[PDB]
Amino acid sequence: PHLVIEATANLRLETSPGELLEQANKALFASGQFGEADIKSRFVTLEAYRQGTAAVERAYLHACLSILDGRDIATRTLLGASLCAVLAEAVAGGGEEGVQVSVEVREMERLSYAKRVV
Amino acid sequence: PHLVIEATANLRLETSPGELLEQANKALFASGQFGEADIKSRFVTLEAYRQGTAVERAYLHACLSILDGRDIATRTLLGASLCAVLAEAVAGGGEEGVQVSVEVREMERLSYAKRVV
Amino acid sequence: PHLVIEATANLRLETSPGELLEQANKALFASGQFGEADIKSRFVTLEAYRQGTAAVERAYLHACLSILDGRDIATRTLLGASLCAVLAEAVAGGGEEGVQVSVEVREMERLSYAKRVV
Amino acid sequence: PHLVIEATANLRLETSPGELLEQANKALFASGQFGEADIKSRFVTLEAYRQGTAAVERAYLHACLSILDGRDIATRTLLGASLCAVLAEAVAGGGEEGVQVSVEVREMERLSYAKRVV
Amino acid sequence: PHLVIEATANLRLETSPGELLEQANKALFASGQFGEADIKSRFVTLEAYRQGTAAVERAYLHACLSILDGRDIATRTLLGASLCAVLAEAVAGGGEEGVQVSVEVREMERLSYAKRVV
Amino acid sequence: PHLVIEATANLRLETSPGELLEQANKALFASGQFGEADIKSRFVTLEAYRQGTAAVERAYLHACLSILDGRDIATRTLLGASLCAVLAEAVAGGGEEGVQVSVEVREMERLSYAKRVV
Amino acid sequence: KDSPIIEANGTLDELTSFIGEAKHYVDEEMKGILEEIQNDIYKIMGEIGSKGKIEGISEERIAWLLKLILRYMEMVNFVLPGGTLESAKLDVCRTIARRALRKVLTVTREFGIGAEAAAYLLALSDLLFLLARVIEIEKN
Amino acid sequence: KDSPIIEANGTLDELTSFIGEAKHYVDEEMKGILEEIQNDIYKIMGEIGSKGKIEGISEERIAWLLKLILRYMEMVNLSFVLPGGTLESAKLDVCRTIARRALRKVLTVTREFGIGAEAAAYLLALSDLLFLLARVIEIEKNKLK
Amino acid sequence: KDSPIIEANGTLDELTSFIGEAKHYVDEEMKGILEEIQNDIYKIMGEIGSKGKIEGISEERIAWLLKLILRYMEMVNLSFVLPGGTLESAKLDVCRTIARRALRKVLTVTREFGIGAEAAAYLLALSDLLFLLARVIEIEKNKLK
Amino acid sequence: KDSPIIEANGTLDELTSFIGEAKHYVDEEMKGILEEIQNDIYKIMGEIGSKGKIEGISEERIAWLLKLILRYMEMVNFVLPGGTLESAKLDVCRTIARRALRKVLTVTREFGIGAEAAAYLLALSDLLFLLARVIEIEKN
Amino acid sequence: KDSPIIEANGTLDELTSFIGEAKHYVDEEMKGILEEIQNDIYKIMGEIGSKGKIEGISEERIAWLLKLILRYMEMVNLFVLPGGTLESAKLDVCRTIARRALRKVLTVTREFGIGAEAAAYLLALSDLLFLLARVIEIEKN
Amino acid sequence: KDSPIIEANGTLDELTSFIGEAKHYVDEEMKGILEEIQNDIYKIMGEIGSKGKIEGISEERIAWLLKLILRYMEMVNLKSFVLPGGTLESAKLDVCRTIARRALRKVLTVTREFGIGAEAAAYLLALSDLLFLLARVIEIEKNKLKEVR
Amino acid sequence: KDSPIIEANGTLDELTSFIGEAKHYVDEEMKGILEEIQNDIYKIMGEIGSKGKIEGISEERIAWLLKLILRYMEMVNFVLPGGTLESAKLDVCRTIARRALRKVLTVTREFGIGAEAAAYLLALSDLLFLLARVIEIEKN
Amino acid sequence: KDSPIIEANGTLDELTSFIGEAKHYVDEEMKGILEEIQNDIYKIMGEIGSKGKIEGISEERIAWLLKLILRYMEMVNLKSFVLPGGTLESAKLDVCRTIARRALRKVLTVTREFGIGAEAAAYLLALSDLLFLLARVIEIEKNKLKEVR
Amino acid sequence: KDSPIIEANGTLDELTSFIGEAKHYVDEEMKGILEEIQNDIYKIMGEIGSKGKIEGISEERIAWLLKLILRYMEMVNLFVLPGGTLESAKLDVCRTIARRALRKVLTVTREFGIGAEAAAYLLALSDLLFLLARVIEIEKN
């Protein structure tokens, strides 16, 4: 599976991006759905962002987990909820109000997927 | 909703990326589909890019991600609304026309997670 | 179509990112599915990443090819496999073990797609 | 059609095996379903047999009629009933209790069936 | 597969029962459907038999091939036709008229079938 | 139910045909599907048989259990497995190689079936 | 009750009614046979109408038909139905018996009952054919 | 002559007829706007009626609706209001609901035949614009229910 | 966003828009009546649109329609008449038929989703009232066809 | 995976769990038997869950059940379930085995696999009945 | 009153009853956890039985299960036969009943579009119960 | 033969087996009641398994359950919802209650498809109500009502 | 006529056409055999096209194929198709024969005719395999 | 057993047979390539015939076709559409190309119904592309391009 | 991209390829005719592949086939086995492939209401190919 975590530059975290990724990967492995080595995550800081139209300082944190298709809705929902809890806990604050944390779970087409080990 | 705008480094915009993002969010709010605070957009400059195989080329691409449940009229309108904003924002770039494109995709609502800290 | 190639910063390639994109575009054109100018690819270096939970140093390379829907599974699979071959051959090394190379092919909704030339 | 009649060696009959086969063939012909020359019947005496598990002396009489498929359940049932009546009447006795008489009607696949006259 | 060949005692054959079984097994193998060692055939002489009701001397020859289900009707028909040709050629004569030769192909339920080698 | 056991004349058994029939009937009864008195079994020695085409000495043992339809596949399979275990254990040896043991379970049409006690 | 059941019972009722008409045109021996058949048909309607709860005809009743069939087969060697008025009635009953047979076959296929009754009706139709021919043969 | 095509074409025809009635109750500016819309609907009917053989409205036509929507939006700042504060605005409220009825018919064509998505987007935006135009008339006359 | 729900909601929206047009051609008394009806329709759209999550109109609202039906009934004593004896009454005849079209859409929702029975009853009574109001206007003007 | 597969595997998992509870209420000989059965059930879940790719139980495992059934049949001559607390546990396991059997039968009918596993579960339910009766008979 | 709703509600009721039995075989800490879980199941039955009209479990409740899963994963080195002890056997039973309930809820989710969070909870619950069962066997042997 | 029949009979069998286990945890009066219930279930299985050919439970058996339900309602005056299994004994009865409900679901399928077993279904519904009451009574007696949070 | 009939007849026509091409690359003995086969295929098209009204191939024609199969089996002991140009033609005909077989099987399943023709085509495909291997073996 | 499986396997068999014929009309290098292709098809037949139980072609086999496609694209710069079969040799390859497409259609049916054979399908698509190129190259070499009118 | 379209287009491609092979076994006059036919098939593939959006063959092309059919009917006295010569065998093969293509096009016509003229062309083509095959055998023997 592939996880992308996106954070606005004005978002303050309790831990480093490195540590957050480690916590995210541990949470994904706890699902029991994935081999350890197959969990690949990355963190991106957003420098050019806008939330809404209001002139209020806002920070947000978003994740997108991509997994190969075939897993049921319970698994997908659990994966999303597990990641959202981890991300929410890592938030220290940012902007002038609350921080929106969201997680999408999407499915990659298994039949056409290609993987190699070099 | 989450909007990602990607622009090649050689693309010249009419305004700053920040201003472009503001126009995009305003257009999205004018659809009447979303709460103002829910609209989140980001801009990315592509530093390593190739178009085709031959020539100086610039392009501009957006991907709008929304929770599923809305009909094709709404999705098409959202895409067309953003495409107009993006097209009007292009001042030039490269030695030819600038391709502008917008994808609208759907996030699975049932499995979606969100919390406010 | 739109191609995104992501490589961990510790990944060693046989060529520059620019040449890899050229090779990928050529492979995509050889499918016969696309007009030359329509093939748009970009390369991203990941600076903040984690693979799995183990302490072993790992590098990975991932691509996501987005195309307008309508093509059959044979075409989608051939595109993925073609890109995977190009990516795998471009890997020189990185990390302390094998490098996982993977390619996803996803479909953009054609009906709602908007495109203009300015 | 092909008729097989199996009788345990301790079964006593009111007639000879030959006479029994003649009666069976007349009963089968009286159904009106078959050409006279097509009715082929045989009688077998079972020398090595066991009925049940109890140390009781028992005799039985069983018949299997094989016909080409295509006939309805009324006809198949009439054939079995006709034969069963002929067999039951032929029984004088056997063992230390009543004699079980049974008749199966089975269907041969017509499409794959092969027949020739030399 | 299991092959049973039944011949009335008054049937004259051009070869021995043994030679006939050998010819049948070669014909069955020539279908290409079975392993050599799996073809099991037996010959039975009918001592107590009656054909029809008329006071005519008749002889017949019948075969029943039992195979595990799964093969299509073309194969089942080819097997029956192959066997019927072998049996018909083996017939020298019998009784006061032509000899009826027939072959059934039946299917054994594969799912419940039990087989072991001791 | 009706059980037929066929054994090639060159097959050596650990017990007599009679004892084998007793063991088979006890195994069939232990399924719980049948009344004791309804289990009718017979043993046949094959004097004229050929297995395969090769000039190899082989022996085989086959059984056919016939039951009235209506039972599910679990029951039909259990009956075959039970019988196959009894037959395989009874085999001492035969020919110049392993002995093939097999059991078929077939269903008699209940609707047309005829049975009487005299 | 169920439509196929209703149709089968009704057609059986029609059969025994037509037999009840025919038995006034035959001699005393055939009359005795036809009235036994009416009793058998009544037994069948009980089984069919009750969807198998009540017992129908025994194997022995079918055996009784077979005995009569074998008897009259001895006397009978393509003819138009109704050579005489009497034989015409039995030819009618024969065709009604086949119509009842078709109705009972539907019940057997759907509900898994009445197989024995179907067999009886088939044999009955054969007997009725034979009885019709015996009458004509005696009357030349 | 497939039924969903015939129904979609028919309802678009009904829409442009009601707009044609409405434009005689609005000021000259809105009348000009309504006539442009009538021309766009004519173009849409050609595409749908031909099962996509003839080109339909362009993205530019949708962008034009959006520009007007943004323009009249800064004049409207409503709670929910009852339709038809004035006779004039009631005519536009009617057209808005006819546009939505047309949108429903076009959506069936898109889902079954794969054509008319842009047309559907146009009709959705149109219904939004007609809402705004109606409130603008009511606000100007001080007749918001 | 189930199709029968969307269609029922859309048609109710069309009904209240036409009523909004009609109320500018009737006297003040009937205008007040039509505006109450517009508010009831708004309440009905909330219930249907939410698949019954939000409470719809009460029995009291139906009883109110019945009271008016009984009131205007003693003024009307018709043979059958052609719709639209006057311009004013023609507007109400239109609303009556739109109400029946809305009723048909709501009936599909009730049969498929088990909600909207009261709403359907309301629309049926409404169509009866609108019939009466139309004839009252014609009788007063002496214009019964 | 497929719903019938999921349901069959899950119900088999429930079966071995209930057996795992029951084995703490029986003596050492029966405990040994129940743990072999748990190993067999695990083998079956492998075959069923993999849609037949992985091999399931052998004929010999069924033969092993038959041997035990014949053994305890010797000791056992209409009774309410649960004469003792111990036998009650085995009666529970018996009914769960039948429930698993129904789930596996669906897989066999749909996918053409698990026939041997179905046979095993049927024989197992018979053994469990016998074991429950043997316990009660010893305790009078 | 739809059959899938009734079946899902009924099987959730069966789950909390078996948990109600098991909690008499565990220590006070584990009993506390199982009784919190019984409360969560009651909330889930409220939502499903009402076809989503009443709110179900919060995502905080899933996070709570996840916390416990991460905690007990450390004292378990993940194949062994179910029911190493009598106590752990009780939890193995509950785990399989939780999976059965999950199958019924999944049917509801696919047919009515509700209960996705409930299903995630039940899946997480079944994994926790597996771990608790193994932990008991370890802390005993 | 018929899957719904087999499933209903199998689930009824599972119910009387769990009742068979539970009856070793209750007192003599309740044990007597639970054993009468096992006999009723056996009668129900005979009717269902035969598709209504062998007679099932009489209406008097349902009247009997109702008598017990009225008797134990006098003893149970719950102010709130309670967590299942306040005691080990009551937990076994709660398990039996839910299995009875599962049996009821299977029998209902048989009733709607074959038109038999309505009285059996009614019996199972009343049984599940009685089992709820018995569970609570035991918890009252030992003061182990655990109210839902 | 019916679509499956049309497709079966057409594919049989394609088969005999490809055989007609192949017979110009083989020797005189094999040429004689292939032309007999063309006559048999023409007979089959008559039966299939007429939905069974006209008689098709006899059992003896199948017996003739079996005799040739047994003959060439004696000479032939996993190989790529088309070891030689000649054998490649027969390999093509073999696969066309299987394609015709699939088309005829559909007719047999739907209309209950052409079973004998299907058997013939199956045996033919086996013979063609053997003929292709015999050619290669002679040419090393 | 399954008709789509049988049809796909049968059509693949027909493809390698036509390739078997064509390889006697091309030069040694192309013959070598066509024989490698026959082996790949044999591997594909084994996987399809077993419904994905026996492994099929590796991704490296598809990479191999792509390498050849890129190599021969350098040699083919068509300005227009051309009529099939400019020479006898190229005609045989055009026949093979169309049979490969027919095989692809059958395998696609298997993929959509059974979820296996996607890589095989991808291989057949690339194969048909390569066969087109080889046909044109031969026609270039002999100057026998016949442009569509 | 519909399966019947793809199948019809593919089988037309197979037809023109086999004709492309056969034309190397005939004389110059016949080669000219076969290459005109290959052009007609290319036009047909354009129309079918575009679901009727692009125009197909004109009726003049059917008339052209009909002219040739009337011409060659005179030198053929219409039952003989296919493939009297190697050359004529090639045309017999093409004829049966033309019929296969016709079956696929017919399916398209019945489902989409297009390709009726194409189907008429293919039927006429198959009859001409039969005649050409017989003419070759006659002009040789």
Ligand SMILES: [N+]
């Ligand atoms: N998309």
